[PDB]
A paper describes a structure:
The structure of the AB-domain fragment, which was solved by molecular replacement to 1.45 Å resolution, reveals that despite a lack of overall sequence identity the A domain is structurally very similar to the B domain. The structure of the segment comprising the A and B domains was solved to 1.45 Å resolution by molecular replacement using the B domain (residues 149–250) as the search model. The structure of the AB module includes residues 57–250, approximately half of the extramembrane part of [name], and 309 water molecules. Each domain in the model contains a bound sulfate ion located on the protein surface. In domain A the sulfate is anchored to the protein through interactions with Asn95, Asn97, Arg99 and Arg122, whereas in the B domain the ligand forms hydrogen bonds to the side chains of Tyr201, Arg209 and Arg211. A structural classification of immunoglobulin-like β-­sandwich domains defined four subclasses, s-type, h-type, c-type and v-­type, based on strand connectivity and topology. Both immunoglobulin-like domains of [name] belong to the c-type Ig fold, with strand orders a–b–e–d and c–­f–g in the two antiparallel β-sheets. The similarity between the A and B domains is reflected in the Cα r.m.s.d. of 2.7 Å based on 85 aligned residues. The sequence identity derived from structural alignment of the two domains is 12% which does not provide strong evidence for gene duplication. The domain interface accounts for 350 Å2 of buried surface area including 13 and ten buried residues from the A and B domains, respectively. The domain interface is formed by the loops connecting β-strands β1 and β2 and β-­strands β5 and β6 in domain A and the loop connecting β-strands β6 and β7 in domain B. The two domains are connected by a short linker Ala149-His150 forming hydrogen bonds to the main chain of the B-­domain residues involved in the interface (Gly236 and Phe237).
Author numbering: 57 to 250
Write the structure that this text describes.
């Protein structure tokens, strides 16, 4: 007969915790009976408990420069377990907001690149690229190229084909884009090649 086991995806006393991923808690040999997370001013963080009670996860954006307190209780045939932990999230030197072109909902020509322009210097171009997901349909191969320290573009080898959906997810919220420059938020754009 085992006592329930709680496992969180963050450690107690962690610092610099990145806010580009949710925080989770799992139970084994039992189910989650209560999970709460609050910030340093006592504001609850939204989360979702799976219907089977085995996993809870945050469902909204954690803030920069915050201390979060997580409490969980699991209950099983073998008794109860509780855990509390506290951690601190990333403290950016600066924030940068990206702007994507073409604009959301636009219909554009066969020579138009995807362009992602950040409003501050990007010292880690590789980190910025990794945070950007391009979807094409019909699918075509393409690649990123930087114009300068602020603007990265993406295109196929030659021209686009008319009737192509292009989806651009710029997910740099929580990502250190070099020298403590973090994404201010995520951006989502979808357009069509006419």
């Amino acid at each position: 007969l085992l006592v329930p086991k709680l496992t969180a995806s963050v450690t107690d006393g962690a610092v610099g915790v990145t806010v580009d991923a949710p925080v989770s808690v799992t139970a084994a040999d039992g189910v989650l009976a209560a999970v709460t997370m609050v910030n340093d001013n006592g504001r609850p963080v939204a989360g979702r408990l799976s219907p089977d009670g085995l996993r809870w996860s945050t469902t909204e954006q954690l803030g920069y420069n915050r201390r979060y307190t997580l409490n969980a209780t699991a209950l099983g045939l073998g008794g109860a377990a509780t855990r509390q932990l506290t951690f601190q999230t990333s403290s950016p030197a600066h924030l940068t907001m990206p702007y994507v072109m073409p604009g959301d909902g636009e219909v554009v020509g066969v020579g138009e690149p995807v362009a992602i322009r950040f409003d501050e210097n990007i010292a880690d171009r590789g980190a910025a690229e990794k945070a950007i997901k391009i979807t094409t349909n019909p699918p075509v191969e393409g690649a990123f190229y930087w114009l300068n320290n602020r603007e990265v573009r993406w295109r196929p080898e030659h021209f686009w084909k008319p009737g192509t959906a292009v989806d651009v997810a710029v997910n740099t919220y929580g990502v250190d884009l070099g020298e403590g420059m973090f994404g201010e938020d995520n951006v989502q754009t979808h357009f069509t090649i006419g």
